[model samples]
Target: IEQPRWASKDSAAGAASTPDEKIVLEFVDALTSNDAAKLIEYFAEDTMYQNMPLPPAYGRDAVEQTLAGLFTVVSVDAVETFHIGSSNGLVYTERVDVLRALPTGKSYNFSILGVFQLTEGKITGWRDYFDLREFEEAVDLPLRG
Candidate 1:
């Protein structure tokens, strides 16, 4: 299979360099699993998650609820990171998030730039930036069209 252009050439390379990056990478894996409970384990008790242009989910419980709600509509297929780096407890990821809609079983991909702040090995804050218009179009497009 031909990998997408934005796919990472070496996904494991950056994870080995720093503990913070490693935790973030593992969090991505948990997300790909589409298990909100598992994903919440990586977050701190007071973590905040925001997908840009949307209301922020504050605290671990809110984050978990937000992810669980999203999982009902779509399942994550993968999070392919093109680039990952960290400095001063913050990790950044440039990646493509692949999702499959539950109702139609249609797949869609979107690019995202995410920032994660880690404190004591747990994610304290996370924010993902992406094009809201692109996301809406992808999810709204008819499968048969």
Candidate 2:
């Protein structure tokens, strides 16, 4: 079973995030670990995230709530990278996410293009672009309302 990784306060801070890209990577790592707190730390208090085909989410609380809902239905098994590039405080990644749906114990795999913006050492913006129709088919879920 996966456990939360934000027990230590310094886990998200300290010298661990010296480089800007590290902050984004840490956020992605937190996502793979399914740690709400850790993942929240990666974003600013007023962060805005375009999470998916769903409507845009705003604020840290919204992000946490969104992640909570997702983690409830699916556990991300791995985030495998196809390519990653960083310039300044922005990091972009193309990756495959391996997931297991808990309700039906089914497998769902998909690709994502993640764009992250780190400013003042916190993620201020995050956008994940993917084919929602493809994901819905893979998970066999009803169309998102």
Candidate 3:
């Protein structure tokens, strides 16, 4: 595995972030791991998440509650090529999701992007963009015709 770039507490100071590469990479790592505490470390209590095709989720509680549920449904071991970048105050990440159902052994593959806005090192607003149909197919759920 390549050593991903990211920001560390010691690598930069307050308000302004230097070496955002580290910070960005760390976000996806935490997500893949479903480490709510670590993920929350970079999120404010009021952080909001919007998946668009789904309802908007608010606050860290939403994040903490959902990770496990999603984790249970995803193929965590199949994750690969998660990358990060930022522009105009937005942090962007692309994650290749390789999900195989633990129960039925079904497979679901897709690439999703998360665009985030950071406030004092915490992600205050987050938007996840992807094909909902991809997930539906992977889980053997119905995709609208």
Candidate 4:
């Protein structure tokens, strides 16, 4: 798997000191690859995804559907992680993701704070915090008006 160019040079070398962090890193890789099928493989059957300010997606199927829709419009160019850590069995990441739209080839950058819970190496819960208005503007969605 190819690591995102925005990742630190040593990111792949060290990856993670703990198993939970490793899972999150792999999940990030899946996101960067824009492979919804591969991304869903990391999710548990009952996984819940909350991309804050938007309605939460319950279960793996819903999550996959959401990702499928996203992958159709844009591809992840890079994910720049400011910090990542795990505590009490939860992995958290602070990152800025760069995405390029397939239609116009325009790039957008959005900052995110993500919390992930893994059970037996599968993501059971994932919540991402970000500015909804920023996202809408980036995608040129009419929802804002």
How does model 3 score by TM-score? Answer: 0.69
| Candidate 2 segments exceeding 4 Å error | 1-18, 137-145
Clashes of each: 0, 0, 7, 0
How do the residues 53-131 of candidate 4 rate in per-residue lDDT, one tens digit apiece? 6778899999998888788777888886666778898998877788887878888787888999999999999999987
Candidate 3 achieves a global lDDT of 0.63
Model 1 C-alpha lDDT per residue in residues 1-145, reported as the tens digit of each score:
2355656656533544688887787788678888888888899998999888677899999999888877877888888777788877789888778888777788888788899999999989999998765455445332221
- Model 1 is weakest, by summed lDDT over 10 consecutive residues, at 136-145
What's the CA RMSD for each of the models?
4.5, 8.1, 6.6, 4.4
Q: What would the per-residue lDDT of candidate 3 be over residues 12-98, giving only the tens digit for each residue?
A: 213334455566566665666645555667777888877656766688888666554566556554454445666888876666656
What alpha-carbon RMSD in Å does predicted model 2 have with respect to the real structure? 8.1
lDDT of each: 0.79, 0.69, 0.63, 0.79
Ranked candidates, highest TM-score first: 1, 4, 2, 3
Candidate 1 Cα deviation (angstroms), residue 58 = 0.6
Best by TM-score: 1
Please, what are the lDDT tens digits per residue for candidate 2 over residues 1-145?
Answer: 2222423333322324347656566567666786676677777887888857567788889988877777767788887555556766777766667778777787766777788887787888898987775566444445554
What is candidate 1's TM-score against the reference?
0.84
